[PDB]
Design an enzyme around this catalytic site. Sequence first.
Site, PDB file in Angstrom:
ATOM      1  N   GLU B 354       0.824  -1.205   0.000  1.00  0.00           N
ATOM      2  CA  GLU B 354       0.000   0.000   0.000  1.00  0.00           C
ATOM      3  C   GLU B 354       0.860   1.257   0.000  1.00  0.00           C
ATOM      4  O   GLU B 354       0.520   2.252  -0.651  1.00  0.00           O
ATOM      5  CB  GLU B 354      -0.943  -0.011   1.202  1.00  0.00           C
ATOM      6  CG  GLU B 354      -1.965  -1.136   1.169  1.00  0.00           C
ATOM      7  CD  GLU B 354      -2.840  -1.092  -0.070  1.00  0.00           C
ATOM      8  OE1 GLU B 354      -3.235   0.018  -0.484  1.00  0.00           O
ATOM      9  OE2 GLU B 354      -3.126  -2.169  -0.635  1.00  0.00           O
ATOM     10  N   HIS B 484     -14.087  -8.247 -11.961  1.00  0.00           N
ATOM     11  CA  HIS B 484     -13.466  -7.299 -12.881  1.00  0.00           C
ATOM     12  C   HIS B 484     -14.269  -7.135 -14.165  1.00  0.00           C
ATOM     13  O   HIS B 484     -14.367  -6.019 -14.690  1.00  0.00           O
ATOM     14  CB  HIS B 484     -12.037  -7.741 -13.198  1.00  0.00           C
ATOM     15  CG  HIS B 484     -11.121  -7.704 -12.016  1.00  0.00           C
ATOM     16  ND1 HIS B 484     -11.062  -8.723 -11.088  1.00  0.00           N
ATOM     17  CD2 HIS B 484     -10.229  -6.771 -11.607  1.00  0.00           C
ATOM     18  CE1 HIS B 484     -10.171  -8.419 -10.161  1.00  0.00           C
ATOM     19  NE2 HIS B 484      -9.652  -7.240 -10.451  1.00  0.00           N
TER      20      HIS B 484
END
Lengths: 97, 594
Positions: B354, B484
């Site tokens: 991250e 997706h």
Amino acid sequence: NLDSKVGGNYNYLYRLFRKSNLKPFERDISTEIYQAGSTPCNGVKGFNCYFPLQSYGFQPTYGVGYQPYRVVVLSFELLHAPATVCGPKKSTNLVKN
Amino acid sequence: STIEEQAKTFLDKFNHEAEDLFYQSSLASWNYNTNITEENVQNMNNAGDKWSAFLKEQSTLAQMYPLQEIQNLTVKLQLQALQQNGSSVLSEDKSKRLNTILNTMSTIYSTGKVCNPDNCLLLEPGLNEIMANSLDYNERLWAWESWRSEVGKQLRPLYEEYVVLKNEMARANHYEDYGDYWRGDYEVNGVDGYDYSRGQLIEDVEHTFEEIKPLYEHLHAYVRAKLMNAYPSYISPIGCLPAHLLGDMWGRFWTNLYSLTVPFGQKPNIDVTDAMVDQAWDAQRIFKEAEKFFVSVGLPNMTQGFWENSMLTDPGNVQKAVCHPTAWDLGKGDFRILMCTKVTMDDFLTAHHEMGHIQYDMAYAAQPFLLRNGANEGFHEAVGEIMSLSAATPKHLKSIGLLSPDFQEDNETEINFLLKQALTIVGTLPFTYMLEKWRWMVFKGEIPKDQWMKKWWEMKREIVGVVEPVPHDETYCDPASLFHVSNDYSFIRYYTRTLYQFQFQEALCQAAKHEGPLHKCDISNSTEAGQKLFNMLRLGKSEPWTLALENVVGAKNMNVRPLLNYFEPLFTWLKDQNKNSFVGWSTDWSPYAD
């Protein structure tokens, strides 16, 4: 911690576009619409006609590097007029005899 | 007087206005994700529509500046994205119905659920968590088969309309099909010798996958040998593995099977979870220790506003925040991350991932708003993964004190570690090459609507070697239920990411003069590798990705050599254990056909 507030401050603007570069120690407050090309503008926004003044986004949440800094520039010029402003002096003790 | 002067003037003013509205649009989504309120849901739609309609109004003036009179490369790239009108090229009826299908398929996926046949749980988290640890044959089949009955069959008329509407947009944009639209992200033109055709990607993913086969066949036979003793009748040695036993719904990652595939259970495994408990670390020092990792390589540290605005936990159900790790980039130096931070071994590697996106955005942040982006869709996540790969090595763990310095490191411990990464990495490439190539064939028109499922499972046994327990007709649609595909996100970024991250892993270890196997390399404390990488990180998409790739690894395209070398210690061990079994699988075997 002062200028930036929640929601943004649009009071401070800047001139993004100008037909040329300003001369040293020159201030231009003209709001006339900048004309990029040969298309006539006449104060009306449109193709190749842009409003030069843009706004500074001010919020405390922006990064440190882009935080607005209040800049105070002192112009030191020595002319032929009599000198007045001088640095601070220092007074010592007085002794007699 | 020249068009270049008129185009640059438009781009200089557009960079300021587009950056101001994008910050407020990203800030409205930040307040909505961290806090669920009636005020934030309205601000996200208001600020989101102001930025969406802003690009539509500026696209009218962008098409009035032809790129034939512009000799500058940086100017044509800034006008490349603004030249496209988006959905404005579609008719008024097709443009309004396009957002309806996208919102309907996303709502059904979120509100979809499978009721217990014996006794109703939603897919995420409910069904995704049960399918991970479920060892039962019937329990996994009930959730896998019944989902596409009320979802895959229901989204079929919505998927048919999704194909027709998106194909009309590519035809107005002078694209061959909608499959070529996603291939336009790699498009490179304007530089002699570095030009990259859009159709070249089809031959690239097919050629690199050929050298993946010998590595994947040995791993697929290793997993099949462990599960063969459970169901010898349904699982053939030369056959294929069932679809519901892959460890989750769609079989994206095999990590869930790492428990039963452990080669040696008599040796301990590397875990930092129990080490952080005795050290008594909180979410504040997790990001602090990861920030020093970027300092050791020469990269700048994190701003004071980054660590102060970070969201370290979820304060109960009063104020709810999404725990899915995501790196949100607002703008003008405002960097924030929304994640729920517990004490686990995975959150340690996730913290480097991250923070890798934030560290990646700092290099090119000096570029204009139009030039702030990754060079492609695969470089976004690849930068954060190479940061986590160096942290998972035993060398980096012994430096800060997580792993004991007396821990024995040998072949038995390293092979166990390389197998866990292989289930996530090696298992992803054939599955990503399979579904993406299937979308390119359907969007092109080579597969009639009736053969969608006929070619889906037929080409599935050839690529990933997976056969269906229950045969399906054309009513079901497998990609329609996928996250997706239903949400219209790029599915190709996962395949190329594996090849890009291993190239960067090998190049940085050669610059710091590391010797030995590649999985023993650690980029910490080495400032030589951070300097060569920093040059590319600040380029973004302002330069061709083929040119920026040569400045690091010296290669102009994707290469499988780093994929084989990093997995070479595992490939030699799998070959010796598969001698008693059959390497490879056959496509003529079926569980219901005997």
